[PDB]
């Protein structure tokens, strides 16, 4: 019953440039109420970067509006995050989150030469 989430993507890029992260679940995503992406920088606490509900209405924080985009894919159970214009401070470990309780394991993302 306990859903398992697995992430993919990550790694490193240059300042300016896009990337796409994927998060795959054990069941149909269309049953889950909310799903979300979270970001934890070294030396600080977690924070949200995108959420999406069962009806596909999404909320973004003001920090990353226009630069990120979250979407469900119903073909294979996978939620995508698209990161278009990157800054140097957007380097952290990223986590996938089901309803509230269940977490993923995270993927490291870094931006430099």
């Amino acid at each position: 019953m306990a859903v398992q989430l697995v992430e993919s993507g990550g790694g490193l890029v240059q300042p300016g440039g896009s990337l796409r992260l994927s998060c795959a679940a054990s069941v149909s995503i269309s049953r889950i109420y909310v799903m979300a992406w979270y970001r934890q920088a070294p030396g600080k606490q977690r924070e949200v970067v995108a959420v999406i509900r069962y009806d596909g209405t999404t909320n973004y924080p003001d920090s990353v509006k226009g630069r990120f985009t979250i979407s469900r894919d119903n073909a294979k159970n996978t939620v995508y995050l698209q990161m278009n214009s990157l800054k140097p401070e957007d380097t952290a470990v990223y986590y996938c989150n089901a309803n509230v309780e269940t977490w993923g394991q995270g993927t490291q993302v870094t931006v430099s030469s």
Partner: protein, 226 residues
């Protein structure tokens, strides 16, 4: 065949009647094609994916009932939503929920008082205003908007024996939010039928008079069923 593909996006319509007739047609021909061996048309045309989609999170008795009848004729299993188990939470989940809804500036106070799921679902305006620090009535109104959105989409199975949540949801989907106030106070489906309005006001925490009246009439109508 290819004719069935035209009836595949019609279900996405905004109006009700289009959805109703599309479901009636598909379910009727499923019942027709069910006794023979050819059930594989529903597989390779991909209509089963849309049916398995729309059955969860739908408050429409006709279309959902028809979709359930269609699925159960093809020998499949109906999905069910995966709702948060709010009333068994701890402080970590409460704080990440506060990150999620956007009230991240209050995560400190909710940590000092050690608010958890059982205490979260029983908050009033005095606890918000006095000691949690939400002074402005606009901010408390936004918070309660978010809370009542969460409460209608929770999973009360670990504490609700008599299945009160479905009884409240059958009246009106907006009413499911009251279920925890009815259970923590002690009520259940059997002994519900003899409660007064003045008990519904301060014990169960129902504030709108209209909801009290509708709940009272609908309960009192189910008078002595056993």
């Amino acid at each position: 065949p290819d004719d069935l593909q035209r009836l595949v996006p019609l279900l996405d319509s905004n109006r009700l009647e289009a959805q109703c007739i599309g479901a009636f047609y598909l379910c009727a021909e499923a019942a027709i094609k069910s006794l023979q061996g050819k059930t594989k048309v529903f597989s390779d045309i991909g209509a089963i994916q849309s049916l398995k989609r729309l059955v969860s999170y739908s408050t429409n008795g006709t279309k959902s009932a028809l979709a359930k009848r269609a699925l159960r004729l093809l020998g499949e299993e109906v999905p069910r939503p995966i709702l948060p188990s709010v009333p068994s939470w701890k402080e970590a989940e409460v704080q990440t929920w506060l990150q999620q809804i956007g009230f991240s500036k209050y995560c400190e106070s909710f940590r000092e008082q050690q608010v958890d799921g059982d205490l979260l679902l029983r908050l009033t305006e005095e606890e918000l205003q006095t000691d949690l620090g939400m002074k402005s009535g606009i901010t408390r109104k936004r918070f309660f908007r978010e809370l009542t959105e969460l409460k209608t989409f929770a999973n009360y199975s670990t504490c609700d024996r008599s299945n009160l949540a479905d009884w409240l949801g059958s009246l009106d989907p907006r009413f499911r939010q009251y279920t925890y106030g009815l259970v923590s106070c002690g009520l259940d489906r059997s002994l519900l039928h003899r409660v007064s309005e003045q008990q519904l006001l301060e014990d169960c925490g129902i504030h709108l008079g209209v909801h009290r009246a509708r709940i009272l009439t609908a309960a009192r109508e189910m008078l002595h069923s056993p």
